[PDB]
Amino acid sequence: IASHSHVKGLGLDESGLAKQAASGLVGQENAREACGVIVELIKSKKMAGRAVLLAGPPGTGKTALALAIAQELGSKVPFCPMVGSEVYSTEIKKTEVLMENFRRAIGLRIKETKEVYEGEVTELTPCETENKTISHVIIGLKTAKGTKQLKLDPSIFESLQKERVEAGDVIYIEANSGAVKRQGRCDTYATEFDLEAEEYVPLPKGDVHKKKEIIQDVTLHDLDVANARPQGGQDILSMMGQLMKPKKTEITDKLRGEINKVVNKYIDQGIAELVPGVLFVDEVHMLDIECFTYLHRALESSIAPIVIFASNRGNCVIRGTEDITSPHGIPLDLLDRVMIIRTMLYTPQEMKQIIKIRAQTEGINISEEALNHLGEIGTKTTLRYSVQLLTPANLLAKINGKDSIEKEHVEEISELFYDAKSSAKILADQQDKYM
């Protein structure tokens, strides 16, 4: 696993100062100590709508710092990575995509109790009554601990019929959702025949009826989707499969209303806790002027999470406008609502240590001479190309039979694989021959 497997944190000291070389990162002291302020602001859970802009040339570690922020935040908060090209959806509104991304960028941890009925069923008698449909169903659930006759609903009886269960088998029942699974027939009946088309499972243990607590985690977008495209049960709502079945094109009336109301009701009663996360939007330069303008209200909203864009262009024409240009390909209207962070261009010395770290992370035993030659290769080419050259050199070394990468291996690899600038020069030399 490559291209992000070496970064596992910002490598900052207890005082928030950037360490020279640690946590898989080297250099970029200013950028890393600044992103420390961002991770602290995110962990504070106090602000909303704040935005950062990691700006720099290609391959200057902006995405590396973006992922290091997530690694520092941990897996408890939702980190939503997104590409600017994702807004161009063909099923939902372009702004709908962005608002749902913002919504899923926010987390919510909630502890919920749920009940379960389980045990080897002894008998299932449908209590009939005139309406002329089945009234109730008495099921005798046996367990290694005890046994209980329980009255369940005709819907649960119908679910059992769908499962095609019979008296004497083992079933798992849940009252909250209403789904019933057939774990198989009791192990005591496995001796009935020499072979059967039946799954066998022993007698369930413990109490027949048991309530258990689970601390789950879901994003606000999860509730939004659950309420927009409901599935539930007890009805024929399965028609969802043909009703519309695109991305539901959510609506503000319920996005900002009922969902916020119910989640605040859950939070203020000690059942749930809000867990704001991070929305990392890589490649923000291909967003349309409409998206840039909606970002104004998105960031000026009191619920938006901490956003992190990545700027790679110096000054070009804005997308969707075709006639106006601005720095970073972002309009000055949105650029005034962000905290820009430089990503310095790497020097030969820092690039050498980066190549060393990448080699030691990719399980490669590169010799010092080969490492130093990669220094020249990287000073003549891009850091990304010089670091990509690593693995082919390891394969060539394995082929040649040497246990380490030497000068000749990296030389052969570089001669076999060209770089962007070399290929551009070759094309310029062969101009009227490449079509």
Ligand X SMILES: Nc1ncnc2c1ncn2[C@@H]1O[C@H](COP(=O)(O)OP(=O)(O)O)[C@@H](O)[C@H]1O
Asked if residue 93 binds another protein (CB under 8 A), the reply is: yes
Residue selected from 214, 215, 243, 428 as contacting a copy of itself according to rule CB under 8 A: 243
- For residue 351, the minimal CB distance to another protein (Å) is 14
Tell me if residue 368 falls in helix, strand or coil: helix
**For residues 244 and 416, which CB has a smaller minimum distance to a copy of itself in the complex?**
244
For residue 63, say whether it is annotated as part of any ligand binding site.
yes
Tell me if residue 140 falls in helix, strand or coil: strand
Q: Which stretch binds ligand X (CB under 6 A): 51-59, 151-159, 322-330, 397-405?
A: 51-59
- Other Cβ atoms less than 10 A from the Cβ of 151: the count is 11
Distance of CA 185 to the CA centre of its chain: 39
Please give the Cα distance from 99 to 87 (Å, whole number): 10
Which helix (DSSP H) or strand (DSSP E) does residue 429 occupy? helix 420-429
Tell me if residue 426 falls in helix, strand or coil: helix
Please give the Cα distance from 203 to 186 (Å, whole number): 6
Binding mask 69-108 for ligand X (x = CB under 6 A): ----------------------------------------
Q: With b meaning 16 or more CB within 10 Å and e meaning fewer, what string describes 78-111?
A: bbbbbebeebeeeebeebbbbbbbbbbbbbbebe
Interhelix angle 407-416/368-380, nearest 10 degrees: 30
Please give the Cα distance from 161 to 144 (Å, whole number): 25
Distance of CA 69 to the CA centre of its chain: 14
Please give the Cα distance from 389 to 409 (Å, whole number): 10
Asked if residue 29 binds another protein (CB under 8 A), the reply is: no
Binding mask 285-324 for ligand X (x = CB under 6 A): -----------x---------------x------------
Residue selected from 27, 78, 84, 331 as contacting ligand X according to rule CB under 6 A: 27
Asked if residue 236 binds a copy of itself (CB under 8 A), the reply is: no
Q: Which stretch binds ligand X (CB under 6 A): 97-105, 162-170, 238-246, 381-389?
A: 381-389
Asked if residue 331 binds ligand X (CB under 6 A), the reply is: no
The residues, any chain, with a CB within 8 Å of residue 157's CB and separated by 6 or more, are: 124, 126, 134, 137
For residue 276, say whether it is annotated as part of any ligand binding site.
no
Residue selected from 48, 134, 150, 371 as contacting another protein according to rule CB under 8 A: 48
What one-letter code names the amino acid at 235?
D
Q: How many residues bind ligand X (CB under 6 A)?
A: 26
Q: Is residue 61 within 8 Å of residue 11, measured between CB atoms?
A: no
Residue selected from 11, 84, 119, 277 as contacting another protein according to rule CB under 8 A: 84
Tell me if residue 247 falls in helix, strand or coil: coil
Nearest by Cα to 125 from 104, 141, 109, 113: 141
Q: Which stretch binds another protein (CB under 8 A): 30-38, 141-149, 349-357, 369-377?
A: 30-38
Site for another protein in 267-326 (CB under 8 A): 267-268, 273-274, 276, 282-283, 285-286, 289-291, 293-294, 296-297, 299-304, 312-317, 319, 323
Residue selected from 311, 343, 394, 414 as contacting ligand X according to rule CB under 6 A: 343
Q: Is residue 306 within 8 Å of residue 79, measured between CB atoms?
A: no
For residue 56, say whether it is annotated as part of any ligand binding site.
yes
Please give the Cα distance from 431 to 346 (Å, whole number): 32
Residue selected from 131, 242, 252, 430 as contacting a copy of itself according to rule CB under 8 A: 242
Distance of CA 181 to the CA centre of its chain: 30
Please give the Cα distance from 215 to 334 (Å, whole number): 38
For residue 57, say whether it is annotated as part of any ligand binding site.
yes
Q: Which stretch binds a copy of itself (CB under 8 A): 10-18, 36-44, 47-55, 241-249?
A: 241-249
Asked if residue 62 binds ligand X (CB under 6 A), the reply is: yes
Partner whose footprint covers residue 361, from a copy of itself, another protein, ligand X, none (CB < 5 to 8 Å by kind): none
Please give the Cα distance from 304 to 339 (Å, whole number): 16
Site for another protein in 196-235 (CB under 8 A): 196-199, 212, 214, 216, 218-222, 225-229
- Other Cβ atoms less than 10 A from the Cβ of 319: the count is 17
**Residues forming the site for a copy of itself (CB under 8 A):** 239, 242-244
Binding-site annotation: residue ranges for ATP? 56-63
**Residues forming the site for ligand X (CB under 6 A):** 3-4, 6-7, 24-28, 56, 58-64, 296, 312, 343, 354, 357-358, 383-384, 387
Binding-site annotation: residue ranges? 56-63
